[PDB]
Amino acid sequence: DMEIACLDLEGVLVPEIWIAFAEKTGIDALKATTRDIPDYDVLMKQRLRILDEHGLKLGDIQEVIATLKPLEGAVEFVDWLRERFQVVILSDTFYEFSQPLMRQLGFPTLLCHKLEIDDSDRVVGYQLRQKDPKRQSVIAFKSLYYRVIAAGDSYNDTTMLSEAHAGILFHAPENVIREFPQFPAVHTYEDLKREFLKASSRSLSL
Amino acid sequence: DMEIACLDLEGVLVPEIWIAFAEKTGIDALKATTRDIPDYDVLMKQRLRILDEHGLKLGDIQEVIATLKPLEGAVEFVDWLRERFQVVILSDTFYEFSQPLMRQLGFPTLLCHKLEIDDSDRVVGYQLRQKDPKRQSVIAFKSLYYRVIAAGDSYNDTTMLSEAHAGILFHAPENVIREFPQFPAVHTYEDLKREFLKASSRSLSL
Numbered sequence A, B: 001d002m003e004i005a006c007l008d009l010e011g012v013l014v015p016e017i018w019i020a021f022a023e024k025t026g027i028d029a030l031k032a033t034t035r036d037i038p039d040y041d042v043l044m045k046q047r048l049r050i051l052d053e054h055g056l057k058l059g060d061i062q063e064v065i066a067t068l069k070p071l072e073g074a075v076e077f078v079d080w081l082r083e084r085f086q087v088v089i090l091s092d093t094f095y096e097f098s099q100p101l102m103r104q105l106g107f108p109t110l111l112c113h114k115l116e117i118d119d120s121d122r123v124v125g126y127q128l129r130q131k132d133p134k135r136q137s138v139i140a141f142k143s144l145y146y147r148v149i150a151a152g153d154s155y156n157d158t159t160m161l162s163e164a165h166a167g168i169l170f171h172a173p174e175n176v177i178r179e180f181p182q183f184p185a186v187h188t189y190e191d192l193k194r195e196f197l198k199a200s201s202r203s204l205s206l
């Protein structure tokens, strides 16, 4: 009966940060995701190039991300979940990029990657923490004898969902839902609550 | 590099929960200690029996514990820490006893043990998650390539502190302080902040 709820960040609790950053700054180029560029090391090399070409330092970038908001209903959902589970966020975001949004969620433990910042505050590099990081985080909780219930919205979440004791697709695209019928797929926070209740070994209230 | 701050709960952020609870009830028989009964299983079995004899269901217990508050300054300290680190609380108490205190700290991730609750809300047993749970939690975060900075107040916390990359003693007894000089020993939240800054590999502000 010892359970950790692991959540993806972008698309589950907050908007896709780079697309939202692109929308705020008018830099259309930054709307690009893995659907356009598969290799995260390349995409991260590129995104950082574009930022530097626009003279956007870390402080500048954080100013923009500070104007973003959690998805409607997301904070209430996190509050509900924290009353019932230990809540850990597993994301391929970066600490320095996501900080203003994480504050609005009450800074739940976040397991993600980091940036490399020079003495002039420029984003020159990044470090991926490890391979298959969300799956490996689930393994770490299993080593502590936790049952893990995980929710994610995209293909890059399916290893986490498969490794967990129970996985839930939230707001997932139809292709993903069709490819992974083993996970319940829901698209409202209330329904997501109900899937956490179904997956739990405990008797919990909605 | 990437840093998790692990905090012991009781004595660092909140009062010793069992002892405070037993005092608040006025029931002398609930006040027996590990000194009176050094076998923990026998002690816990006795506690559960006396609770039941006095009709104290989980809801009654939590109502009493909900009158406890975090130590003066602990709320601010947790907030300060969450701006700078990923924060995880480690404890040898039970989820059901800590829940009303955790709520007051914004429900940071808590890795601890669990009680067994029957359908009538009676406390009918307990489950320890694993041996040396705090030390093993540090090992789990190391398996995800985190550097761990830990703080604790007791002799038993020293396994956790030794396992961490940096350990800090907070409100520790003289015997612990002197036998473990490798951990800086402090007793105010401001000094605790300063020890987290010293232990960090990153440039962080007070």
Ligand SMILES: [Mg+2]
Binding pocket: A008, A009, A010, A011, A012, A152, A153, A154
């Ligand atoms: Mg996502």
Ligand SMILES: [Mg+2]
Binding pocket: A010, A011, A012, A153, A154, A171, A172
């Ligand atoms: Mg999505």
Ligand SMILES: [Mg+2]
Binding pocket: B008, B009, B010, B011, B012, B152, B153, B154
């Ligand atoms: Mg303690």
Ligand SMILES: [Mg+2]
Binding pocket: B010, B011, B012, B153, B154, B171, B172
């Ligand atoms: Mg103490």
